[PDB]
Amino acid sequence: TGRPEWIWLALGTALMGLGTLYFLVKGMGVSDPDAKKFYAITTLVPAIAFTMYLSMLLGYGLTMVPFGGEQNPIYWARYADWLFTTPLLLLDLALLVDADQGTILALVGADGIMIGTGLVGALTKVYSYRFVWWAISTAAMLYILYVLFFGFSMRPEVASTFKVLRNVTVVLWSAYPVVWLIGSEGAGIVPLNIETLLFMVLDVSAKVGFGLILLRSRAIFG
Amino acid sequence: TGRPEWIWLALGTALMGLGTLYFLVKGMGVSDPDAKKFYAITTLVPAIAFTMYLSMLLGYGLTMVPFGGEQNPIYWARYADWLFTTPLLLLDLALLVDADQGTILALVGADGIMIGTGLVGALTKVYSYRFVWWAISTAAMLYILYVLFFGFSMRPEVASTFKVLRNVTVVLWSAYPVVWLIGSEGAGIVPLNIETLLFMVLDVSAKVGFGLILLRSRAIFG
Amino acid sequence: TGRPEWIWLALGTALMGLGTLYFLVKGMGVSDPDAKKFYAITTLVPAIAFTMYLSMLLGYGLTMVPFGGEQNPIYWARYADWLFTTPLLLLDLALLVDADQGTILALVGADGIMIGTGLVGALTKVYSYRFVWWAISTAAMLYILYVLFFGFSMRPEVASTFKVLRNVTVVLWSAYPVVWLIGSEGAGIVPLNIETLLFMVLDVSAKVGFGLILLRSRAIFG
Ligand SMILES: CC(C)CCCCCCCCCCCC[C@H](C)CCCCCCCC(C)C
Ligand SMILES: CC(C)CCCCCCCCCCCC[C@H](C)CCCCCCCC(C)C
Ligand SMILES: CC(C)CCCCCCCCCCCC[C@H](C)CCCCCCCC(C)C
Ligand SMILES: *C/C=C(C)/C=C/C=C(C)/C=C/C1=C(C)CCCC1(C)C
Ligand SMILES: *C/C=C(C)/C=C/C=C(C)/C=C/C1=C(C)CCCC1(C)C
Ligand SMILES: *C/C=C(C)/C=C/C=C(C)/C=C/C1=C(C)CCCC1(C)C
């Protein structure tokens, strides 16, 4: 449309749709209960992202937020996506290493706090307070990354695949607070069209790339 | 009140309230942990529906949505109901057959996508896009119905009761997208008062009727 | 600020932040999976409350609701807090006694209904209907308290700690509907600044006080 960022919302919609259908077909037949869990979790992630990219593409998941005396276009649908897809991504990691339930609830709850405070930050109309919420969300993110590294006798197959996905997760997820800080939600240094491109590449990599690595590994089977 | 549909919201409120109290009393005493699960799940469903019917009856769960150049009365509280009650109904089915956790997460997540895209469709102000969301929600519904039929050594008691509830579920749930399509959320072929009657009969049947069948079966006991 | 109640939102923010960091540090090292669960649950509660107190303090979690012909300041962020923190508090109790899953789902679902109908009551613009929602929420609360007392061979260590936390829970949680009834959400007998003080003392006691009792007990270890 008239929104220059439309092309990246359209490409992200397509890519998440295609990833969803690929993983759907791929998991057809799988009978191992353990593998079944990883396919469900991992197919659901880009399915949810597909709907929220389409909602941005059609204009539904966009609102205007007054701050710095302007009307700032804020895509809130990203936070409805991430609210469900980032704990699912963490559950994939957690199941892979057989984490303790206490550790899984710490991770999902820290993740809820990360996304919910990012959403409050995104909708806050007092510009300086936006970055108070950024900082608290960043601190929740660093707790999560801490736990993925210092909280975890795996069969060597598990260990290997987990190490790769853990490194993929730390590098990609750490970029999100930087994009938000420099982008239209934060300091406004990078235009919305380039921010939207950055988040499209991260999201597709963190969902479809991550899941291609995982669903190719024998680590997901008993 | 002045809303002609008030009578059906009032009758649905009453019927869900009465079903809730019936199942509450009925489960009193039950000590079998397995049965306890089915009573909790099955009592909670019409309890939640009671609150959301009452919220429609009092006007709280109604909003106006501009589309086709008019101010369309949209009862959004139905989606807050269904968001929680339809996965609970699916958990009742899933526990009955002892489904794999992977299969249960596929079902709840597809259900979330069904209701959340129905809600976006219900609130979308570009009329043609309303039916894009309908189609995606319908596709999620057909995945769910697919899985209830082709994804599942039960004791014969389980099998029998599950087959009846599965057929009840396919027939009733399949009517919802048709009512939405022809009703005030969609093409506007059927007036809101008759739509509200249709959804009242479906909801009471899918909640209180379904639960009367289930909570009468010995299938829920170890 | 100019809101007289600011001081109690500031003190509650501080106290929940300090409790969160205390329990975070305290649980460092714990390796017992059972204890790990109680630390996760119990650290998350004041972490979530911290964010929602800060959101009230900065003005984000406050809205104006017209009722009784005025513009009533309603802090809705309390309900986003309680939606997650009160089932977590109930899970702490439930895990302590090894409750049946049926019993845990009854408790979380009744809790959802308690907070969600309190939120509808808080935002309802027809003054008399506000108290219809209060009554239904109160009835959900009495079901929960009923179950904590008449629904539950514990090692004596569990029993002892559970009895203390159960009495703490009945006394503190029972005060919330009274504060709401006499406060700005209800009859408006007590000013918002004193209501906000009452809820700060209850919340800190029900979260940080409760958790100090629990995380000091050996009951949380296998
Ligand atoms: C059969 C396999 C390999 C998958 C192909 C199905 C299509 C869907 C997406 C899968 C590919 C993505 C790999 C993740 C990595 C990336 C960094 C994603 C960033 C996207 C940018 C565009 C580059 C090309 C693509 C259009 C595939
Ligand atoms: C003891 C048993 C049988 C239950 C009676 C308690 C009351 C609550 C509801 C239970 C009855 C409903 C059966 C479900 C089937 C239907 C198709 C429901 C559609 C409702 C339409 C009105 C018909 C009559 C009723 C008011 C019972
Ligand atoms: C090391 C221990 C004891 C904890 C201290 C860390 C600080 C955070 C909060 C812990 C203290 C609270 C106990 C709960 C009981 C109360 C009734 C809370 C009501 C608060 C009112 C103010 C009273 C003093 C306080 C500022 C500690
Ligand atoms: C599928 C998409 C994924 C994996 C997205 C991850 C998003 C985050 C890690 C977001 C982090 C943020 C912060 C740490 C700071 C505040 C802003 C956020 C929400 C962008
Ligand atoms: C308790 C009520 C139940 C069982 C309701 C079920 C609702 C559905 C199956 C709704 C389905 C819909 C679609 C498939 C298309 C879009 C509109 C919906 C949400 C009505
Ligand atoms: C961390 C805070 C806790 C433990 C808060 C508990 C809140 C309740 C028990 C609230 C109860 C309410 C009712 C019973 C009636 C309606 C109003 C409420 C939501 C305040």
What are the DSSP calls for chain B, one per residue?
--STTHHHHHHHHHHHHHHHHHHHHHTTT---HHHHHHHHHHHHHHHHHHHHHHHHHTTTT-EEEEETTEEEEE-THHHHHHHHHHHHHHHHHHHHTT--HHHHHHHHHHHHHHHHHHHHHHH-SSHHHHHHHHHHHHHHHHHHHHHHHH-----HHHHHHHHHHHHHHHHHHHHHHHHHHHSTTTT--S-HHHHHHHHHHHHHIIIIIHHHHHHHSGGG--
Residues 92-111 of A with CB under 8 A from C: 100-103, 105-106, 109-110
The residue whose two tokens read 């210092």 is A150
In chain C, which residues have their Cβ closer than 8 Å to the Cβ of A109?
A: 40, 44, 47-48
Return the domain boundaries, chain B: 1-222
Of all residues in chain B, the one with the smallest CA distance to C112 is B48
Q: How far apart are CA C111 and CA C12, in angstroms?
A: 23
Q: Is B58 strand, coil or helix?
A: coil
- Tell the residue nearest (CA) to atom 12 of ligand 1: A209
Q: Which of C42, C50, C44 is nearest to C17 (CA)?
A: C50
Q: Which CATH superfamily is domain A1-222 in?
A: Rhodopsin 7-helix transmembrane proteins (1.20.1070.10)
Query: To what resolution in angstroms was this structure determined?
Result: 1.4
Give nearest CA residue, ligand 4 atom 6.
A173
Binary contact (A38, B109; C-beta < 8 A) = no
A18 within ligand 1 shell (Cβ under 6 A)? yes
**Alpha-carbon dihedral C201, C206, C207, C209, rounded to 10 degrees:** 80
Q: Is C152 on the interface with B (CB under 8 A)?
A: no
The approach used to solve this structure was X-ray
Query: In this structure, which ligand is nearest to the CA of C25?
Result: 3
Q: Which two tokens stand for residue C148?
A: 């904590």
* Beta carbons of A102 and C44 less than 8 Å apart: no
Q: Which chain C residue lies closest to A109 (C-alpha atoms)?
A: C44
Judging by DSSP bridges, how do beta strands A70-74 and B63-67 pair with one another?
unpaired
Give the CB-side neighbour count of residue C76, counting CA atoms within 13 A: 15
| Ligand 5 geometric centre to CA of A216 (Å) | 35
Q: Are A30 and A39 in contact (CB under 8 A)?
A: yes
For the record, the structure tokens of B132 come out as: 């894009």
**In ligand 3, which atom is closest to the CA atom of C19?**
8
Chain C CB contacts of B59 below 8 Å:
126
Strands (E), chain A: 63-67, 70-74
